[PDB]
Enzyme design. Sequence first.
Site, PDB file in Angstrom:
ATOM      1  CB  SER A 191      -1.503   4.789  -5.541  1.00 39.09           C
ATOM      2  OG  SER A 191      -1.010   5.000  -6.856  1.00 39.09           O
TER       3      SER A 191
ATOM      4  CE  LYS B  26       3.386  -0.584  -7.035  1.00 39.63           C
ATOM      5  NZ  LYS B  26       3.773   0.704  -6.409  1.00 39.63           N
TER       6      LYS B  26
ATOM      7  N   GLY C 278       0.914   6.248  -0.761  1.00 40.11           N
ATOM      8  CA  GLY C 278       1.421   5.297  -1.770  1.00 40.11           C
ATOM      9  C   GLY C 278       2.162   5.992  -2.900  1.00 40.11           C
ATOM     10  CB  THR C 279       4.482   4.603  -5.539  1.00 41.84           C
ATOM     11  OG1 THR C 279       3.651   3.557  -6.040  1.00 41.84           O
ATOM     12  CG2 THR C 279       5.466   4.032  -4.539  1.00 41.84           C
ATOM     13  CB  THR C 280       2.954   8.937  -8.584  1.00 41.02           C
ATOM     14  OG1 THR C 280       3.432   9.757  -7.515  1.00 41.02           O
ATOM     15  CG2 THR C 280       2.044   9.753  -9.477  1.00 41.02           C
TER      16      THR C 280
END
Lengths: 204, 243, 250, 195, 195, 244, 5, 5, 231, 221, 241
Positions: B74, B61, B29-31
């Site tokens: 994440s 988000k 997943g993204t940071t």
Amino acid sequence: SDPSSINGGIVVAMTGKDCVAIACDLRLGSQSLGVSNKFEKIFHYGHVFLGITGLATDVTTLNEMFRYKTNLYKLKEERAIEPETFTQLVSSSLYERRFGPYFVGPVVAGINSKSGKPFIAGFDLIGCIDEAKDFIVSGTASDQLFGMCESLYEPNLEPEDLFETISQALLNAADRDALSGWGAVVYIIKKDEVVKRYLKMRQD
Amino acid sequence: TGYDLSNSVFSPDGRNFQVEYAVKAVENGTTSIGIKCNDGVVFAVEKLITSKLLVPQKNVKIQVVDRHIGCVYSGLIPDGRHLVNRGREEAASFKKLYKTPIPIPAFADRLGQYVQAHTLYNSVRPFGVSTIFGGVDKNGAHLYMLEPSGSYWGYKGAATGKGRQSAKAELEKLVDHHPEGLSAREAVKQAAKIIYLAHEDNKEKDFELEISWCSLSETNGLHKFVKGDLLQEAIDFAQKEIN
Amino acid sequence: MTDRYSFSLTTFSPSGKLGQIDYALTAVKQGVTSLGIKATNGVVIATEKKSSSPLAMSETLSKVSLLTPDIGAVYSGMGPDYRVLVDKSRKVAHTSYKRIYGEYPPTKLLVSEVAKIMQEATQSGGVRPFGVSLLIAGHDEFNGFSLYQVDPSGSYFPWKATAIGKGSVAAKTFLEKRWNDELELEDAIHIALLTLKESVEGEFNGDTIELAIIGDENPDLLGYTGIPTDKGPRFRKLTSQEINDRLEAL
Amino acid sequence: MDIILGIRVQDSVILASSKAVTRGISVLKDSDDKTRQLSPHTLMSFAGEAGDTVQFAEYIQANIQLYSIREDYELSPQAVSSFVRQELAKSIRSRRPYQVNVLIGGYDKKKNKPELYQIDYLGTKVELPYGAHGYSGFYTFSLLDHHYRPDMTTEEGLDLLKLCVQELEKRMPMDFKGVIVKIVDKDGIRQVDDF
Amino acid sequence: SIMAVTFKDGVILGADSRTTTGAYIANRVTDKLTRVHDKIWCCRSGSAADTQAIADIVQYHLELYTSQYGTPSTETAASVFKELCYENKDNLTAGIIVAGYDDKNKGEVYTIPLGGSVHKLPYAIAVSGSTFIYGYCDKNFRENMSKEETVDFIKHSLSQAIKWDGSSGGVIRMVVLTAAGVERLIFYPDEYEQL
Amino acid sequence: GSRRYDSRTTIFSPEGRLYQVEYALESISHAGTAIGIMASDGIVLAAERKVTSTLLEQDTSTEKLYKLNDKIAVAVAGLTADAEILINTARIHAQNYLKTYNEDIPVEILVRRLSDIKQGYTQHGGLRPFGVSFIYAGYDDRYGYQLYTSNPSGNYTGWKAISVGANTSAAQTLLQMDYKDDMKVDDAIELALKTLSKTTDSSALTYDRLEFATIRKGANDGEVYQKIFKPQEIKDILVKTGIT
Amino acid sequence: XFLFX
Amino acid sequence: XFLFX
Amino acid sequence: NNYDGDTVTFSPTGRLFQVEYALEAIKQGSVTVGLRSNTHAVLVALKRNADELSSYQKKIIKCDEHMGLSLAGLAPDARVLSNYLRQQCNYSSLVFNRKLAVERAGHLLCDKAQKNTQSYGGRPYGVGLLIIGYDKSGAHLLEFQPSGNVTELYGTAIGARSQGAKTYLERTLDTFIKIDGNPDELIKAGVEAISQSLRDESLTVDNLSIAIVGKDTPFTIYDGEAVAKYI
Amino acid sequence: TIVGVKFNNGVVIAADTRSTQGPIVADKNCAKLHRISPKIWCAGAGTAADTEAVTQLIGSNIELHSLYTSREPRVVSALQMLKQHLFKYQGHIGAYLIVAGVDPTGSHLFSIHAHGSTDVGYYLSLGSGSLAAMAVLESHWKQDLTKEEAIKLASDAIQAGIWNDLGSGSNVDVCVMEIGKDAEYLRNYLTPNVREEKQKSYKFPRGTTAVLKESIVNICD
Amino acid sequence: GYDRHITIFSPEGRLYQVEYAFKATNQTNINSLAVRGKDCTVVISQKKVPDKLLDPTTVSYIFCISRTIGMVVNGPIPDARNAALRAKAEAAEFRYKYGYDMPCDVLAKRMANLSQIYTQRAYMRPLGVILTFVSVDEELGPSIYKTDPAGYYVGYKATATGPKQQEITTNLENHFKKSKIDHINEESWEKVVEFAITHMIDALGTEFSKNDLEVGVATKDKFFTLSAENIEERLVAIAEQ
Ligand SMILES: [Cl-]
Ligand SMILES: [Cl-]
Ligand SMILES: [Cl-]
Ligand SMILES: [Mg+2]
Ligand SMILES: [Mg+2]
């Protein structure tokens, strides 16, 4: 509209010397109308005798119920139920229907096959136990029976004498109650023999 | 073997491989980061711009729980949303009975017990998210990080996702260089920088920055998003630091 | 979520074996030796107290359990499975008997109820059988003294004397030689201690041996006076001191 | 649903049931048959609350017909009466009880004896030489106590019933539009065509 | 008659000791001051059975709350009392005064009357079977009163209630909630009557 | 999920057999032999106890022969624990019928219901079937003396003489050889014991390894007595027939 | 009922 | 009903 | 391989294969385009037929007067999810006298799809949806995927060869976004976009399906002779 | 009439032995003292079936609790279990109980009402004779009573009920629970109401009753 | 071999899922120790905070179950907190139903019975934790009762749990052989904590700072954990002797 006094009828039980006696009238009515003069209120499960007064449908239902329960008892225990144990079973079974009770006044009579001790007990409709040395009464002429029993009864009567006492107690009580009578049965219960006598009484 | 095919099964090591596999989804997943400050907490996240066709500022988000708790995660975004939905039910039922808004440690265990429950049966899958959350209560500021196993601890700084090792390193420097504490407005600027530095591990697609904060002084103990001038000031600060 | 295991985990193999019951009996075999001997005037049940650690207090862990005032139970196999079976056994003695008849159940009928619980774990969905064999010693007015074994299958058999667990094969041979129909209770306790010494390897004293009797009524253990018919419990657990006294004249 | 009578004689059971169905101040029907055949040698007459009577009668009929098919055997009158009583005894502690009173007349082929059972809505069962339900009993019971002999024939029994019906027509306030009479014997169930 | 008063150091709870069945005093030494937490107490009025059942449940909730989230606020205790009283208002007849001491918030008093509403007040008095009095000598009560002044204020107030009322009587019990701890006070009739 | 650990106890083989029923019958074939023989004036139930131990309490023991009511008994072959579940069900069904009709339950009706319970476990529920075969010996006023058997499949059939458990093949051949329709109870007693004596896996058939019961009309005038034989009564009947 | 200031 | 000190 | 039996099993690399297989059903589905300006939002769908004797599978479903979607993949799943959206739009109207926000519509679909990816026995949804609407914050276009991932976009496309139309919209972004108060021109841009995803087959009268919603335009679907103008 | 009296080293409970149907005395010698546990005893007033049933059920659950915890049961456990049960049924179970006992904590005396309220006291009275009993308790109770003094006070309070209350009568039952000793249950402790000799014997000459039929009943198998 | 995946018997009569749950116990690499005084029960556990970003105040494996009962867990924190919340619920419910504080040994038995169900029911996995319950019981006095994933429980004079459990066990065994008694003959709880720490140092062969240890103390009518400063004062006392 009082369930306990629609059909009518009485049961009385008494202890003697090495014997017990239980007796009932034979009347079943619908209030004022006499319907049946052959309605016995005394049943036996082995050597334990149960008399039941009150609403007749519940008398029949409870007989069928205790036959069921004592039949299963005998199969599992491999012996006939005793009066003391049967008393606790009647109590349990009635209080199970605490808020929808059977409208009945049951009376237990019998001799413990081990100790030979005469035993009688009475119950209210929700299964409170009245254990008594002398006598137990039930039904629409319970007041009448209490009067007769409290004056006529003496301890340690022989079977032949006890028969006369309980017979006179029932007959004279039933004759002062409109919803009781139409014949009577007396069981004399000794340790290993039981005599059953039908009494001649006025049919009104 | 086959100890990894079913959730809630212990391997001979004493490990739940299905939980360890869920962690791989989180690492993919993204940071996302959290920074605890003097009188509150700051949350920031990396939003990958897949296409020009994405509407800027309109794919939020970071989620709020009650009015005082921020949540960022994440991994599988839908699993994060499912967990926050549960968090909102837990926070509501707590406030309904006890009146006071749910304390952060209390809230942390509510998510903890729920996630842990999804490692007890083979009829369910573990959560594919690490969740960084916290806020301000009666006892002050709290920052937590919760993992697919149900494991959570308190943190001075937290990081998860593809750029976690980069973010963690930059977080460790802040703790060392500011022992007496970091201010709320400072933590917002630092949060921006750390996301930009962590974006080096995900530099194929360009990204959009998103920051939120709870501060007793700056937001009056409530969760708010950083928007307008304060957001652009933090972006400018981060742009200046990479060059 | 929810218990999706509503199907049997114990099934018939092509050979007609019930695997999980066979494997449960294997767990019982690994278990510490326990035995029971029936005398004319009582019953003795005994087992070794295998202590997990010497720091552990072996008094707190009770391998011999009172089920009713006149019924006691000992086991071989998985202790935890025994502990929950004793809890269920004590409750079912009340719910399915005492609360109906106003008296404690006879030995055979309580055994029958324990057997039923263990049979259900053999057929019900999403459960394994109990990994224990029970020895249940008891007295009742109409059957007198009796000793029963109960197996993971739910099968039970009445015994004059028997043993279960680690050294049961050897222990049963020893009991066959010593047992007669004229044994007094003290004689059966003596034989029980002799039989158990064979299967015990380490220390053999009142602190490593757990032993209880079904014998005479104990008025002193009743806790009240005034009702002549209530004469007190027939189940008595022998003390550490009482065991050591009978190990001197051994 | 007012008058249902029953007489057990030497070799048969006779059921008499009033033909009138009344609602309000109107007699809707004067040919109503208040009886169902439970089995070839067992007949049940019924009286009580409207709807409940037929609904209960047909329900019992179906259950006995089901037993007959399943076991290829005719349940004894004693057995049928015991089943019926138990259904009424369940009813009385229901949400809405069946307010139905029944007579069961049967011939027991094993004992070669006629049997008459009287069961009220409470499930109060009694075996009698003759019986009745409602206000009919108040006139017919004393009459039958006088003229009934146990060794009577079917013809004697029908004449005894005529005496009962004539007394009811004289002293009963409502018009029950006569009775349908059915005889149950060793040969089964037949209806007396003219009464 | 029950009351709770907030003063400088904490809060004092006071009540009578009389429990009535009709005109018969079932208990003349009743303890109407009940502990739901170390420094959260309540005064019970209305049904003895209902107030005991509620107090026992609230004590369970605060014991469980303390295990997980540490010492609960007086507001939290009041909320739990209200929840039970409001949701079960149809089957309950309980009027409760909640008094608690926090080191942060000091002495707080909450009243849950028959409605199941919650009200935070400086002091509360309920008399004549849960009848909360507004006013009640508002000039007689000041904020940051001394402990002795508060004891004297409650002693007088309850004394006047017992004098006019027959529902209230016996001894006056008080519980003092402060940082120092919990103090129990009792005043016998001979002391409080000559007021 | 849990699908992985489901044995699917209630499915057909490609040949159209029920796996778990077939394997349950394999289990029962290793159980002690039970024989029922129906005569004109009574029924005999004989059963062999599974390899007895010398220290087993013989007199106060019940493994094979159980009482259902005053007129019906069963001989068990299989898991005793499974049998007891079904026996208590059958004892209740009998008392339910007596309560409803005020008549003792006809033998077939009790057998059909107990057989229908077994059937249920093979068609639905996903549980293992009952590893039990019964021989029902009973009397009613319709068909008189009756012998039935039921097996885990829930199928039941009527018999003049039948065996269940171990060595049924051998036992059925011997019964088919010596049985005749005008046989007496005393003759049927001798046949039952002689059959067990030849089929037994033991060295010699002794009283301690047997359970025995008769349903006769031996009581005074048109009433049925169930005699569950005592150890000493088996010892006597074993000497009288000249097996010991 | 019942007891009840 | 009843029996009722 | 071993980890694709059900939706309750992660792969050793942390993938849900049953979800990825559900996503594959969408790629097999017929192309549908979504795009919006500030005033209007448009859905364009290429309908698919079984053969020349069959009808063309309807791709566009109305959810309220101000919201609807186009589908690609399992049509029955689109019916289940569109029926759920209708009920949530309806609940919002009846209880709160409030038109459901397009963003909340997205959040509700996401959370419904998610539950079907975490529970044993159930399966993921096998359909992708493009939700358009006009609410209190103007025009909106959403992309739903049965993983639960919902995304707000100026434009997008899903289905077979969707990449062609998605590339065009990425180039045209600056042009079509400013088509305000001109429905026909915004549809024309949508029709030219879907044309970039055609191979051999061209847009016919009973093949093309268009829907539009906007400021003073209820969600209306155009089929048959009504879309002849845009060929 | 049922009373509880606390003394120096224990608690004593007493009761009368009269059971009634309306105005009729059904039982002249019924036991109103119940053993919940060996050292926890209960005196019951109100609906006779309810007091027995509620005492037996809690007594059963207490026995199971005692086995589970491997500890002598406590009076507060019996009290808590009884009050919660009685509260649940909103007074429909008409049991008014005096609960006394000795446990590791010490000696306790409680009363429970049918609606589920409990009190604590040194002396308590319940039933129709409670006012007659309480009058004696209020007149003669003092702090630091001896066991002999406590038995006398309890029995005197029951006597007050027997003599002055129509609902109470016959004999006096006492149960003494002292710390470190077995509870001693004194059934028919006092019998001050013995029926006097009857003037005449009502024994009938045999054959006095007319008999229609005789038959032997078969009770054997 | 699906007999290793769920709690059913292996051919040799074993439950592998139970055995593997025991191995999960040592996943944290933390050693705990419990001893009894005259008036008190002391429990000490190693505290390891490897990450610098962690808030060390929130890193704990000692829980306050009731106001008299304390519980230290050897195993992963998720399962530890699962057991903690359940024990807290069970202790509260007990007090409500039976009107007295749940004893240490009865809570232990209850949690052990719950653990037993997980070993017999297939849909539930065992918790990978060993629960050490401590209190000063009002009947039994200073009490230590320990639960494991098998559903086994027993009382202890003293006990140790973790990777180097055996080394701590034999250290305590040898002391009780010498002292000839079942407890630490010491008046104040302060000196019982000093004993616990001293014997852990001797057994593990490692020194401890104030932040390397976590201490729980049970007295009559309360169980409490020591702060870093409370431990530091205690470490100074040991060093100065
Ligand atoms: Cl109160
Ligand atoms: Cl804690
Ligand atoms: Cl438990
Ligand atoms: Mg008369
Ligand atoms: Mg498991």
